[PDB]
Design a binder for this molecule. Structure first.
Ligand SMILES: [Zn+2]
Length: 326
Protein backbone atom coordinates (compact mmCIF):
# COMPACT_ATOMS: atom_id res chain seq x y z
CA UNK A 1 0.00 0.00 0.00
CA UNK A 2 1.21 3.50 -0.90
CA UNK A 3 1.92 6.30 1.58
CA UNK A 4 -1.33 8.17 2.38
CA UNK A 5 0.16 11.54 1.42
CA UNK A 6 1.69 12.15 -2.02
CA UNK A 7 5.36 13.06 -1.40
CA UNK A 8 6.30 15.99 -3.68
CA UNK A 9 10.08 16.05 -4.30
CA UNK A 10 11.78 19.15 -2.93
CA UNK A 11 12.60 21.71 -5.63
CA UNK A 12 16.30 22.33 -6.18
CA UNK A 13 16.00 25.90 -4.87
CA UNK A 14 14.51 24.68 -1.60
CA UNK A 15 17.03 21.86 -1.20
CA UNK A 16 19.88 24.36 -1.54
CA UNK A 17 18.28 26.82 0.85
CA UNK A 18 17.63 24.17 3.50
CA UNK A 19 21.21 22.91 3.07
CA UNK A 20 22.71 26.35 3.76
CA UNK A 21 24.40 26.85 7.12
CA UNK A 22 25.91 30.05 8.53
CA UNK A 23 28.13 31.08 11.45
CA UNK A 24 25.00 32.47 13.15
CA UNK A 25 23.13 29.20 12.44
CA UNK A 26 25.87 27.09 14.04
CA UNK A 27 26.00 29.59 16.90
CA UNK A 28 22.22 29.45 17.30
CA UNK A 29 22.18 25.65 17.39
CA UNK A 30 25.10 25.55 19.85
CA UNK A 31 23.47 28.12 22.15
CA UNK A 32 20.31 25.99 22.16
CA UNK A 33 22.36 22.83 22.81
CA UNK A 34 24.12 24.40 25.81
CA UNK A 35 20.79 24.36 27.69
CA UNK A 36 20.60 20.57 27.39
CA UNK A 37 24.24 19.74 28.22
CA UNK A 38 23.47 19.31 31.92
CA UNK A 39 22.50 16.29 33.99
CA UNK A 40 18.71 16.11 33.96
CA UNK A 41 17.67 13.08 35.95
CA UNK A 42 13.99 12.60 36.70
CA UNK A 43 13.25 14.29 40.05
CA UNK A 44 15.97 16.94 39.77
CA UNK A 45 15.86 20.73 39.59
CA UNK A 46 17.89 20.75 36.37
CA UNK A 47 15.32 18.39 34.80
CA UNK A 48 12.61 20.92 35.72
CA UNK A 49 14.69 23.74 34.24
CA UNK A 50 15.17 21.84 30.98
CA UNK A 51 11.41 21.11 30.79
CA UNK A 52 10.65 24.81 31.38
CA UNK A 53 13.19 25.83 28.72
CA UNK A 54 11.57 23.54 26.13
CA UNK A 55 8.12 24.89 26.98
CA UNK A 56 9.15 28.57 26.98
CA UNK A 57 11.10 28.21 23.73
CA UNK A 58 8.10 26.79 21.88
CA UNK A 59 5.49 29.07 23.46
CA UNK A 60 7.70 31.99 22.34
CA UNK A 61 7.32 30.67 18.79
CA UNK A 62 3.51 30.66 19.22
CA UNK A 63 3.13 26.87 19.33
CA UNK A 64 0.49 25.22 21.45
CA UNK A 65 2.39 23.54 24.28
CA UNK A 66 0.90 20.90 26.57
CA UNK A 67 2.55 19.20 29.52
CA UNK A 68 1.42 15.62 30.11
CA UNK A 69 2.38 15.30 33.77
CA UNK A 70 1.81 12.32 36.03
CA UNK A 71 3.37 10.41 38.91
CA UNK A 72 4.53 6.85 38.25
CA UNK A 73 5.84 4.00 40.38
CA UNK A 74 9.48 3.08 39.74
CA UNK A 75 12.13 0.88 41.40
CA UNK A 76 13.17 4.15 43.12
CA UNK A 77 9.65 4.78 44.41
CA UNK A 78 7.17 7.33 43.07
CA UNK A 79 8.59 9.74 40.52
CA UNK A 80 7.13 12.75 38.71
CA UNK A 81 7.12 12.68 34.88
CA UNK A 82 6.13 15.33 32.33
CA UNK A 83 6.02 14.79 28.59
CA UNK A 84 6.12 18.01 26.57
CA UNK A 85 3.95 18.11 23.44
CA UNK A 86 4.22 21.13 21.15
CA UNK A 87 1.81 21.41 18.23
CA UNK A 88 2.12 24.08 15.55
CA UNK A 89 -1.55 23.95 14.54
CA UNK A 90 -3.66 21.95 17.04
CA UNK A 91 -6.69 21.91 14.71
CA UNK A 92 -4.90 20.26 11.76
CA UNK A 93 -6.12 16.69 11.42
CA UNK A 94 -2.73 15.10 10.75
CA UNK A 95 0.64 15.52 12.43
CA UNK A 96 4.15 14.92 11.27
CA UNK A 97 5.57 14.01 14.69
CA UNK A 98 9.25 14.46 15.55
CA UNK A 99 10.28 13.12 18.93
CA UNK A 100 13.07 12.41 21.39
CA UNK A 101 13.51 12.00 25.17
CA UNK A 102 14.70 14.79 27.46
CA UNK A 103 15.51 12.87 30.67
CA UNK A 104 19.05 11.63 31.26
CA UNK A 105 20.10 8.28 32.68
CA UNK A 106 20.75 8.04 36.42
CA UNK A 107 24.22 6.50 36.19
CA UNK A 108 25.61 4.83 39.30
CA UNK A 109 29.23 5.49 38.32
CA UNK A 110 28.77 9.26 38.33
CA UNK A 111 27.40 12.37 36.66
CA UNK A 112 26.08 11.53 33.18
CA UNK A 113 25.45 14.26 30.61
CA UNK A 114 23.87 12.11 27.88
CA UNK A 115 25.09 14.46 25.15
CA UNK A 116 23.97 12.12 22.35
CA UNK A 117 21.32 10.57 24.56
CA UNK A 118 19.45 12.75 23.89
CA UNK A 119 20.64 16.32 24.43
CA UNK A 120 21.53 16.70 20.74
CA UNK A 121 18.13 15.41 19.51
CA UNK A 122 16.37 17.79 21.93
CA UNK A 123 18.36 20.72 20.60
CA UNK A 124 17.75 19.59 17.01
CA UNK A 125 13.97 19.67 17.49
CA UNK A 126 14.07 23.18 18.97
CA UNK A 127 16.50 24.28 16.26
CA UNK A 128 14.11 23.06 13.57
CA UNK A 129 11.23 24.99 15.12
CA UNK A 130 13.34 28.15 15.45
CA UNK A 131 15.13 28.07 12.10
CA UNK A 132 11.97 27.19 10.15
CA UNK A 133 9.56 29.40 12.13
CA UNK A 134 8.74 31.83 9.31
CA UNK A 135 7.99 29.03 6.88
CA UNK A 136 6.12 26.98 9.48
CA UNK A 137 3.87 29.90 10.46
CA UNK A 138 3.09 30.42 6.77
CA UNK A 139 2.34 26.71 6.30
CA UNK A 140 -0.03 26.79 9.30
CA UNK A 141 -2.33 29.25 7.48
CA UNK A 142 -2.92 26.96 4.48
CA UNK A 143 -5.79 24.89 5.88
CA UNK A 144 -4.22 21.75 4.39
CA UNK A 145 -4.89 19.44 7.38
CA UNK A 146 -1.23 18.79 8.15
CA UNK A 147 0.98 20.22 10.89
CA UNK A 148 4.22 19.65 12.79
CA UNK A 149 4.25 18.25 16.31
CA UNK A 150 7.25 17.87 18.60
CA UNK A 151 7.18 15.40 21.48
CA UNK A 152 9.81 15.50 24.20
CA UNK A 153 9.25 12.30 26.16
CA UNK A 154 10.12 12.07 29.83
CA UNK A 155 11.30 8.96 31.64
CA UNK A 156 12.64 7.02 28.66
CA UNK A 157 15.50 5.58 30.73
CA UNK A 158 15.29 2.78 33.29
CA UNK A 159 16.05 3.60 36.94
CA UNK A 160 17.60 0.14 37.46
CA UNK A 161 17.81 -2.84 35.07
CA UNK A 162 15.78 -2.15 31.91
CA UNK A 163 12.45 -3.96 31.89
CA UNK A 164 8.93 -3.54 30.48
CA UNK A 165 7.94 -1.93 33.81
CA UNK A 166 11.13 0.11 34.26
CA UNK A 167 11.56 2.11 31.03
CA UNK A 168 9.55 4.25 28.61
CA UNK A 169 7.47 5.81 31.38
CA UNK A 170 6.51 8.92 29.42
CA UNK A 171 5.91 7.25 26.08
CA UNK A 172 3.83 4.40 27.55
CA UNK A 173 1.74 6.99 29.40
CA UNK A 174 1.20 9.25 26.41
CA UNK A 175 0.38 6.44 23.97
CA UNK A 176 -2.31 5.13 26.35
CA UNK A 177 -3.67 8.65 26.99
CA UNK A 178 -3.98 9.41 23.28
CA UNK A 179 -5.41 6.00 22.42
CA UNK A 180 -8.16 6.48 24.98
CA UNK A 181 -8.92 10.06 23.88
CA UNK A 182 -11.66 9.53 21.28
CA UNK A 183 -12.17 11.79 18.26
CA UNK A 184 -13.37 11.69 14.63
CA UNK A 185 -12.64 13.32 11.26
CA UNK A 186 -15.75 15.55 11.52
CA UNK A 187 -14.29 17.18 14.65
CA UNK A 188 -10.97 17.88 12.90
CA UNK A 189 -9.67 20.19 10.17
CA UNK A 190 -9.13 18.78 6.67
CA UNK A 191 -8.46 15.06 7.26
CA UNK A 192 -7.36 13.10 4.19
CA UNK A 193 -10.25 11.42 2.36
CA UNK A 194 -9.45 7.78 3.23
CA UNK A 195 -8.66 8.54 6.89
CA UNK A 196 -9.71 6.29 9.74
CA UNK A 197 -9.70 8.48 12.85
CA UNK A 198 -11.07 7.04 16.10
CA UNK A 199 -8.71 8.57 18.67
CA UNK A 200 -5.78 10.97 19.03
CA UNK A 201 -3.20 8.25 18.17
CA UNK A 202 -4.63 8.03 14.65
CA UNK A 203 -3.67 11.68 14.02
CA UNK A 204 0.04 10.82 14.28
CA UNK A 205 0.69 10.39 10.57
CA UNK A 206 4.26 9.26 11.17
CA UNK A 207 6.53 9.51 14.18
CA UNK A 208 10.17 10.23 13.44
CA UNK A 209 12.07 9.38 16.62
CA UNK A 210 15.58 10.80 16.97
CA UNK A 211 17.87 9.09 19.50
CA UNK A 212 21.62 8.78 20.19
CA UNK A 213 22.63 11.45 17.68
CA UNK A 214 25.74 13.58 17.65
CA UNK A 215 28.58 11.07 17.30
CA UNK A 216 30.66 10.84 14.13
CA UNK A 217 29.44 8.80 11.14
CA UNK A 218 26.17 7.27 12.39
CA UNK A 219 24.72 4.38 10.41
CA UNK A 220 20.96 4.38 9.92
CA UNK A 221 18.80 1.67 8.34
CA UNK A 222 15.10 1.32 7.65
CA UNK A 223 13.65 -0.48 10.70
CA UNK A 224 10.06 -0.62 9.47
CA UNK A 225 8.73 -1.61 6.06
CA UNK A 226 5.61 0.44 6.80
CA UNK A 227 7.63 3.68 6.57
CA UNK A 228 9.97 2.74 3.72
CA UNK A 229 8.50 5.51 1.50
CA UNK A 230 9.36 8.13 4.15
CA UNK A 231 12.77 6.61 4.97
CA UNK A 232 13.65 6.69 1.26
CA UNK A 233 13.10 10.47 1.30
CA UNK A 234 15.84 10.79 3.92
CA UNK A 235 18.15 8.69 1.71
CA UNK A 236 17.32 10.88 -1.30
CA UNK A 237 17.72 14.18 0.55
CA UNK A 238 21.10 13.10 1.89
CA UNK A 239 22.25 12.09 -1.60
CA UNK A 240 21.11 15.42 -3.06
CA UNK A 241 22.85 17.43 -0.33
CA UNK A 242 26.07 15.58 -1.14
CA UNK A 243 25.57 16.17 -4.89
CA UNK A 244 25.24 19.89 -4.12
CA UNK A 245 28.43 19.88 -2.03
CA UNK A 246 26.55 20.99 1.09
CA UNK A 247 27.84 18.31 3.47
CA UNK A 248 30.85 18.84 5.72
CA UNK A 249 33.47 16.15 5.16
CA UNK A 250 37.14 16.00 6.29
CA UNK A 251 38.32 15.85 2.65
CA UNK A 252 37.06 16.92 -0.79
CA UNK A 253 35.17 14.30 -2.84
CA UNK A 254 33.91 12.33 0.13
CA UNK A 255 30.20 11.75 0.69
CA UNK A 256 28.13 11.07 3.76
CA UNK A 257 26.30 7.75 3.81
CA UNK A 258 24.34 7.96 7.06
CA UNK A 259 21.05 6.67 5.70
CA UNK A 260 21.89 3.26 4.26
CA UNK A 261 19.74 2.29 1.35
CA UNK A 262 18.87 -0.92 3.16
CA UNK A 263 16.85 -2.36 5.98
CA UNK A 264 18.35 -4.12 8.95
CA UNK A 265 17.05 -6.84 11.23
CA UNK A 266 17.48 -5.34 14.66
CA UNK A 267 15.12 -4.86 17.54
CA UNK A 268 15.60 -1.69 19.54
CA UNK A 269 13.39 -0.74 22.46
CA UNK A 270 12.74 3.00 22.60
CA UNK A 271 9.90 5.52 22.91
CA UNK A 272 8.34 4.38 19.62
CA UNK A 273 7.35 0.98 21.03
CA UNK A 274 4.06 1.98 22.73
CA UNK A 275 3.05 3.83 19.55
CA UNK A 276 4.13 1.04 17.19
CA UNK A 277 1.82 -1.27 19.16
CA UNK A 278 -1.07 1.09 18.31
CA UNK A 279 -0.24 1.16 14.58
CA UNK A 280 1.60 4.49 14.44
CA UNK A 281 4.06 4.43 11.53
CA UNK A 282 7.62 4.84 12.88
CA UNK A 283 10.86 6.10 11.37
CA UNK A 284 13.54 5.38 13.98
CA UNK A 285 16.53 7.65 13.47
CA UNK A 286 18.94 5.88 15.80
CA UNK A 287 22.40 4.60 14.81
CA UNK A 288 23.39 0.96 14.62
CA UNK A 289 25.81 0.38 16.24
CA UNK A 290 25.11 2.79 19.08
CA UNK A 291 27.81 5.43 19.71
CA UNK A 292 30.86 4.00 21.48
CA UNK A 293 30.14 6.34 24.41
CA UNK A 294 26.62 4.91 24.97
CA UNK A 295 25.73 4.90 28.67
CA UNK A 296 29.27 5.78 29.68
CA UNK A 297 30.46 8.88 31.48
CA UNK A 298 32.14 9.81 28.18
CA UNK A 299 28.77 10.67 26.54
CA UNK A 300 29.62 14.33 26.94
CA UNK A 301 29.97 17.54 24.96
CA UNK A 302 33.53 17.06 23.75
CA UNK A 303 32.75 13.63 22.25
CA UNK A 304 30.16 15.18 19.97
CA UNK A 305 31.11 15.59 16.31
CA UNK A 306 29.95 18.99 15.14
CA UNK A 307 30.32 18.49 11.39
CA UNK A 308 28.05 15.41 11.67
CA UNK A 309 25.50 17.38 13.69
CA UNK A 310 25.50 20.14 11.07
CA UNK A 311 25.02 17.57 8.29
CA UNK A 312 22.13 15.94 10.16
CA UNK A 313 20.53 19.35 10.74
CA UNK A 314 20.58 19.98 6.98
CA UNK A 315 18.99 16.60 6.27
CA UNK A 316 16.31 17.20 8.90
CA UNK A 317 15.51 20.75 7.76
CA UNK A 318 15.23 19.58 4.15
CA UNK A 319 13.08 16.62 5.23
CA UNK A 320 10.62 18.78 7.17
CA UNK A 321 10.55 21.26 4.28
CA UNK A 322 9.79 18.45 1.84
CA UNK A 323 7.13 16.76 3.97
CA UNK A 324 5.28 19.99 4.83
CA UNK A 325 6.05 21.65 1.47
CA UNK A 326 7.53 24.67 3.21
ZN1 LIG B 1 20.27 6.10 27.21
Amino acid sequence: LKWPRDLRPLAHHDLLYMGQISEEDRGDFNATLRNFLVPRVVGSQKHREVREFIVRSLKDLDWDVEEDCFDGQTPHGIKPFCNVIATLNPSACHRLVLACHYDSLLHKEGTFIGATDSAVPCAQLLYLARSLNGKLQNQKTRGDGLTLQLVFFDGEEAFERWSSHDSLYGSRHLAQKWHEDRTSAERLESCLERSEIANQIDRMEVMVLLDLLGAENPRFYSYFGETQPVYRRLVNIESRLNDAGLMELPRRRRRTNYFSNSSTVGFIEDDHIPFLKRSVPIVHIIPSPFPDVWHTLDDNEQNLHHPTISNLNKIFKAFVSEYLQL
